[PDB]
Symmetry: D2
Subunit: 327 residues, 4 copies
């Protein structure tokens, strides 16, 4: 029995007896993700190189993927009439939606994750976290400052060899594969669970000289297992969306701890850490900063940064033990 994202969301909406506003918001997301996917795959690039004549700004004067993606997400989410506040990785201030388009939801998103991998064509993506506004006050940024544990839905779209949307809600994590031939997301994995233990560690070891003792010790074990067991294999794509997705399906651990240049970690709490921590906990995994649960941090800034360790429970647990081992 074929099941598309469209049918799945609509039905989950019926089972929860929703009024239909969130379902409309998710349908908008779906559409946004497809438009970004098409532009990311370079559809119609021939026009920029003068196939129809008029080869004007054939350099850098037209929308760069980062910006185009941010416009699609904002414009589409707005037009869903289900949001009131929006937080983008590409915007300094929270985006307060006009009253005539205002909804009860707050969305925190990363329109195009994997910044440094854009020019080399490595996998990139979009990340999103949705909150139900809780307060009778007028829309402001504080409405997006809720701890991740208050997330109603979170997930991401991966633009890789193929495009896949991973959606996580109260009752589980579901994976949908995009069939570009018909512009439809097909459910291929129902209520997914990450393996208890993996054999892959993911981190940028270029910061070796800045790692804290716990991280430094953990890495030593993956390369030189004290029990002489087989060493973990290493993998680091460079785009958080890509590295987290492999972690979800293959197992293992992903890491981005603090360092000199980034004392509180590089990844942002609102639209990078929380959505992935939610997807991970719902899949049966763990997401810690090393001292606490990511979903428990009470955000104080819109672009606040936080250190994160996520993946299989046994692999993450072992690293927490190291942290405690170091007082």
């Amino acid at each position: 029995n074929i099941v598309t994202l469209t049918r799945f969301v609509m039905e989950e909406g019926r089972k929860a007896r929703g009024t239909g506003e969130m379902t409309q918001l998710l349908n908008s997301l779906c559409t946004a993700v497809k438009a970004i996917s098409t532009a990311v795959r370079k559809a119609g690039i021939a026009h920029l190189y003068g196939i129809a004549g008029s080869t004007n700004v054939t350099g850098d004067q037209v929308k760069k993927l980062d910006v185009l993606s941010n416009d699609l997400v904002i414009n589409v989410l707005k037009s869903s009439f289900a949001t009131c506040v929006l937080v983008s990785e590409e915007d300094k201030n929270a985006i307060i939606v006009e009253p005539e388009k205002r909804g009860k939801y707050v969305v925190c998103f990363d329109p195009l994750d994997g910044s440094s991998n854009i020019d080399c064509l490595v996998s990139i993506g979009t990340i999103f976290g949705i909150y139900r506004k809780n307060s009778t006050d007028e829309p402001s940024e504080k409405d997006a400052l809720q701890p991740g544990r208050n997330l109603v839905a979170a997930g991401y779209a991966l633009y890789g060899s193929a495009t896949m949307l991973v959606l996580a809600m109260v009752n589980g994590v579901n994976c949908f594969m995009l069939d570009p031939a018909i512009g439809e997301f097909i459910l291929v994995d129902r209520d997914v669970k990450i393996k208890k233990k993996g054999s892959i560690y993911s981190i940028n070891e270029g910061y070796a000289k800045e790692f804290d003792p716990a991280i430094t010790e953990y890495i030593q074990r993956k390369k030189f297992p004290p029990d002489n067991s087989a060493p973990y294999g290493a993998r680091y794509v460079g785009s958080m969306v890509a590295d987290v997705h492999r972690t979800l399906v293959y197992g293992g651990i992903f890491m981005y701890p603090a360092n000199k240049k980034s004392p509180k970690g590089k990844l942002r709490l609102l639209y990078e850490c929380n959505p992935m921590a939610y997807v991970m906990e719902k899949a049966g995994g763990l997401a810690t900063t090393g001292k606490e649960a990511v979903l428990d941090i009470v955000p104080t800034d819109i672009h606040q940064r936080a250190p994160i360790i996520l993946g299989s429970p046994e692999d993450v647990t072992e690293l927490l033990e190291i942290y405690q081992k170091h007082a």
Copy 2:
């Protein structure tokens, strides 16, 4: 003036006064690559999941992506009437084209590189190397056992966020972006040259306990710069075609030396090492095993393996200097 790959190959053929056979071969390669990417992006997957019933098929043909890609290369190249010997990473023996479809070119190809990243949707691709048959004798595997220096043309197609085919021939390297909307590869970078020195090192550090001393000394040097400069960033996609392409565009160094499981390295010489080595040297870069030039190795086995270090000249020679410092 916009330049399509079809326009480019044909003109390069005219400038070389060829009979048109090599032109027909490249055109067929262009067609094969488009087909493989369309399949990689999962076009038509809804059918596998029963969108039109469950009797459309008369057998159980769930062809795995790697097999399907290999089937496409084989049939498409053969229908070009320009080849006589084919070596695939997928077949134990060389494939000898039937007399009627026989041409004078030898093609060594890697159907879909990045096998471990197929299920997690990370970038994968196809790598190729073309040689002229140099023997009046009847075509056999021997004609495929030539040193990389004899290549007339080599390259690859990358199926990442977007699909790009990179082709290198005697007169230089050129990158073409596939425009999925019209099924056309567009020339977007001419006579490409790699940076003399980069700031990214690429290797699977999970084999740390099995690396030779030269590799170990170099890694520490990237993490702890003796001149005290900023340490190189680390990147390891897990797919050679992917990691090699970023090395070309961003500069830096890619490494896959020998280890316990692979005493002579893991990567294959004919359709992995050689093609990428030729692309690199043509871009003014380097590619060595650590003791000699990859393109100079005369193979004795079509599936022979070899250790490889490629990338920016200054980066590679620095490592080559560590090797020759020990021994």
Copy 3:
């Protein structure tokens, strides 16, 4: 403000306070129409001609568009869990859906209209009429034997230079253009109304020798206007979906009266005449058999045929006057 079919239908569902079942059925229709559109445009035809090898039944042994379209519609509508009875132009008996998939709606459809235009690649399409089952009896064919005037929704998808879906419901007719680049239907025409009078007559004059006096007289006027005004132009695509769509947007009249071979007309009441008569009346046009309203006929057979005259009100009215003129 961008509006997609997905958002439009969902919203109309909210305004009517529906439970969500019909909305799910319409979403299924939308998906069906896209899959048919892709197969109609010949996506992936390269495989049938041996691009990946195995050129077996390269003649006539695989699904012909007529059949493939009928499978997609049936399978998709079934999987929507909103139907109980289905009437297809390609099936002799009414299709009674399994209890575990049963809904309250009855759908009458023409999966691929324009049979004779398939091989010459002329415009073809899909037509549909939806009824809300009215009776506590068990699902049977009689449930689809309701007069067109009981239609809850009707319309068609036109596979022409571009693909467009025309949807008609109680509050109007709306036209949606398909953007194949993202697999999304975009609303381009809101609540459309046909012009009071056109300048185009559409009919197969090859049956001249069989036309009744009224038709014969009417045609004389279009070619030789008694008042010496400019003559109407003639247009006959051959596919009902194509001819009716032009009629809706340009105005004029479309005709398929009785003849020798077809004493009661060739076009079928259930899935050709009623849906178009409904779309036409909702757009402000007329649909008569010459003696009565199409939407008023009480069907007695599932594949019953009926004569039809449709289009601008003034053009249709004038022909009715001729009929009365002839007692």
Copy 4:
């Protein structure tokens, strides 16, 4: 063995021992046609309707489909470095290619045929005819004023339910189906031949009061067969490229004789009449004005018009016999 249009043109070039210029011209024509169809199918229309905002553009460039198609043909042909004189149904004067991009071929083309069917989404297309410059003089419109019999190659691309390019050259006619999924035209019918006699007549009968006696006598003969056989079916799409293509595949007769508004017929000789006439004769069919062969007319005006009757030999000669019976 699967045959792509790219493979076919190149090989036909090799067999003819050409320098490769005409091969490069045809390849460019292949590229242009793909681009036009992708635009015709409305790829990317969501952008026009603001899916990404309302500031993406820096001007008002709502290029109409016919203008865009003309822009593509002009720029793409010129970037082929194989032409010197271009005549478009869209430009009052011939376009003389700049000396640097000058080649020896003359191309007469119809950017998008079927203008009256553009808004109603009925089939439309592009028609072309190629000639060799036959004059050492400087290129001018005169080089485009040659009799149809001098064509080296002619054909058209049909954008109907699917896109098909038909190409006719000295050795016969061949049809290629565009596979939108890989952007490749597939050879699906070789050395095509029209039926000696069909059963469909195609003409706009809205000009009945302006037809000459021969045309009138023939129409009555199709409606009232003197031998009392079954009357021919009528078909008139309104787009020449469409009606002509069905005539080729199904056989029969197509007609557009002279009338009051068009004393010398409406259709243009250089890029409408001639190309279709050449395709027809090569398929063993006929094409006359009623008094002479279309391919024999020596034009004096690039936008000159001419009456035309084409199709199955027996059908056309029957009409040619009515003409020569009167006068």
